[PDB]
Write a protein that binds this DNA or RNA. Sequence first.
RNA 1: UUCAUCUAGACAGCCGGACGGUGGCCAUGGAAGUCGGAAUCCGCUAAGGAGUGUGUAACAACUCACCGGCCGAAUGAACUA
Lengths: 197, 158
Amino acid sequence: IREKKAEYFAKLREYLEEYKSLFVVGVDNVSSQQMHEVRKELRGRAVVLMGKNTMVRRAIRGFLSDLPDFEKLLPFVKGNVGFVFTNEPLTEIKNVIVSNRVAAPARAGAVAPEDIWVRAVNTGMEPGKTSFFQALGVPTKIARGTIEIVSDVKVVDAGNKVGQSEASLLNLLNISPFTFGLTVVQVYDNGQVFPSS
Amino acid sequence: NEVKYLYLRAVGGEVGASAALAPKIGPLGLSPKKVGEDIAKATKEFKGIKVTVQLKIQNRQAAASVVPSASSLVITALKEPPRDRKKDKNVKHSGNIQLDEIIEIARQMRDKSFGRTLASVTKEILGTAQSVGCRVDFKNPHDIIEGINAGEIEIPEN
RNA sequence: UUCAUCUAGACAGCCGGACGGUGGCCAUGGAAGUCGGAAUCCGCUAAGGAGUGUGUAACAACUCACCGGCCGAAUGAACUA
């Protein structure tokens, strides 16, 4: 256990004194294919090292003696966040990181990434699913055996975890708005951190 | 035109049965006979060894495309007489495929793979060969992988 | 009593994921990581087991190990009387 502890510490040290800049990438809601693809795109350009918050915090505190910069990086590693080290233009590294986003389906009890509406379109299903439509109280009429939502309804949005009801509704609507992807909290660069924005 | 996608696992260079063709393709107005024949033609080299066959149904053309399967390709290079189901079930494989050949399969599979290095992709394909259980360069793929890891098999990374 | 885990976050719970190659090969009537048979393959790895199990004729799909987030300091096992 302590051996692999030291190994992880050494790898963090290597990246910290081998890569001029790093990004603080959040992996919340993110699948594994996501960060695999992001590493594939970043290959050569950037490397990705993610891990346990306490792990990285202790490593940083133990490197503090030699690197007096990272006390400002200590208070930024919270939640599911890791470090993408690089020696390449911050902008392009960032867009490559935040570009690979897979449209996963709307699942029950899953915080909606954005304001998922029910935008009116000839959806093409039947009273069986009109049951769900009424369940969530969206006026929907059976147009030639193809449902149409008369009025847009503000079902879900950022946060407000998607209950089974809305999840099922969006699944039958065949919309995958949960385009999960790695986010960026802050940006370390040459001993200077600044927000991504 | 509609971009449709459908594959199978029909056995290589063996006419595909209509009971295993019609349920999938039959609905979308496409000839199972044509599908089977095209599969056999694309698996001419693969004869006997099952292969995945992607079909792009762009307005109803049964144009088979063999997608490279690492293990099946390994067996095709193993060159064992096409597996004779009749003579004996579960025909074992013991192909002597050379390091050059396994590297070749690595280059022909890296396209759709995730191995960091060409060496990594070689280790993947070697692991597939190990799963197959054949002996490779008079050695097991496990020890070949360990040699590559310990820096013995200098890989032509091109 | 002895052996362990543990602020370099222990056990419990909750939440998120739990891969690519790969529905791996072999076949099973049908197995799709899992009725199944050998190896538990490489890479990315925080993690992911050709998977832990369930489900399905098979599926599609879940779920667990596993890893993270929270939490805050204790916990687990085998014994003795």
